[PDB]
Structure of galactose oxidase:
Amino acid sequence: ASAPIGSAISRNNWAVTCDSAQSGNECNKAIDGNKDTFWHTFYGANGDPKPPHTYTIDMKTTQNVNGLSMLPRQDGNQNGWIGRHEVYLSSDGTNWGSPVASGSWFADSTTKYSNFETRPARYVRLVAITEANGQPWTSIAEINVFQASSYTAPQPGLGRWGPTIDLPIVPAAAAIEPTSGRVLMWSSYRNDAFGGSPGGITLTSSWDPSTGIVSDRTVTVTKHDMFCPGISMDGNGQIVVTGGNDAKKTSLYDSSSDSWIPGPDMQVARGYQSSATMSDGRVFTIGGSWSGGVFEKNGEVYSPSSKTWTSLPNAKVNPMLTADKQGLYRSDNHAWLFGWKKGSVFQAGPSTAMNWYYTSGSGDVKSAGKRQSNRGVAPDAMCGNAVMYDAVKGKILTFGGSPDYQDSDATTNAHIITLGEPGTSPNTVFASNGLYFARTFHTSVVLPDGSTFITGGQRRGIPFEDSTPVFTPEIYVPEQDTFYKQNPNSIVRVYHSISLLLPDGRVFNGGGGLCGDCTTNHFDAQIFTPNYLYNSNGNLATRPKITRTSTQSVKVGGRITISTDSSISKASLIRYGTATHTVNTDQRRIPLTLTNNGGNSYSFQVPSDSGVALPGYWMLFVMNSAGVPSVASTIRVTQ
Ligand code: NA
């Protein structure tokens, strides 16, 4: 199950309108209180009018709406089950504006919801754009509207949440398809659960920011249930998904062909391990005792060229283990890994102990010291996040998490780690005064400007429970060494949520749950629009445009020339991300130094070090003096 974010509104006084209704299947059947009676559009003898179909509610009064429920026809028949939909609010009944929520509902008879940010409204409208099976009708047994306890206008200058994207599944794993710009999400063998999988199947779903279409697809070709895996975008631009429910499998997603390809089996079966792309396009993985057994799982490395997994037994997991109470089952999970110089992998935590992993010969691991500051040695921060916001200066921001995977209090601790040469002890200091809010299970993304957006989580880690939620996101401004609270959202994002940067510079935040019958499944996502996209008036700012790119594929050391429509002040490269269970080893930012060629023409050099400019796909963003970013240009960086 799922749940609405508010309280059901009294349907006493309501006035409802439909595009059609078959006698017996009248509009009002939908708000009668009887799950046995439903509204149904014309059929048979009345004809079969295709969708869109519409349900308009006049609540007669103004309420703080925050959601809606749609209980499908419970008579064993599928006819009229809403797939694609859009929800609109209106204070007047004429001017609706943009949908507050849209996406697709899974084809089943469970109550479906639309949770959205609170908005004062008198009129509601649900548009059924499609029928779950491609049929013409639309049926609704019961429809409810929810209200917030109160309404608080988002404050100016602190970004905005919305709209909500409804999905058929809990997006507990997501990636950005670099070629398409689509957000790819996967759950498990089921749309709402992982437990009891026969393995070999994965439900996936894609959201296209450009069209707003949510398209779903079952993957079986790779004979893998991709729940609880390792994710890395290799040197080739292919997404490497490893283990999880099918502990030894590897599945390869090729954005280019929009296809899933079976990969080689890992040497060791793992679940909940982290994997990281190396300076040579290879993928390194270590740990993962959630599945495939609980024992010391040393490193192994994947060669996209030979399509082999090679064990690196001397790349020892032991030094990176946290002191988790549940033991190894959790202690080797979600390592904060970063591919660095010369085939090295840096492990920034969660363990207090940081380490250098080497991939030559049978591997090696060297101690890089302890995460600490003037405030002390940092404790284990299981499920804390780690973001490399300046790969040129080797700057990594770390924050939140807790000593144990669950039933532990989250921290406010935040640190800056500055990496040097592999084998050396990096410098670590405290970040400002730490987070405004302790959190675990939160997610984060590095934005075009080098700031880090941090959202969701809870104060105390209790998987599948929406307790002690943090609704206030924070942004860390490196230049200022300051954290800034942003406008709060309304939907809890704890265990199993994700965040990804979209090519347009907005953040996609979604998921949480995946616990079957629980009422904590969130079959949605929301868009956060950072303040850099607005002007003072609260309207959207005008964005520089990249009118030209000399090439869309460059070698490390390579030079790119672009023309813009306006004079640009700054530019950055951001590696395409992948995310699951707080881990995102693919994203990183490179601040570029621009050569002003006159006539709004500029050139920049891509770092010559493939351990900085890890190969794969990147997004190029230009900023005007105002600080407004362009939408990204996609650049393939090859070694
Ligand atoms: Na009814």
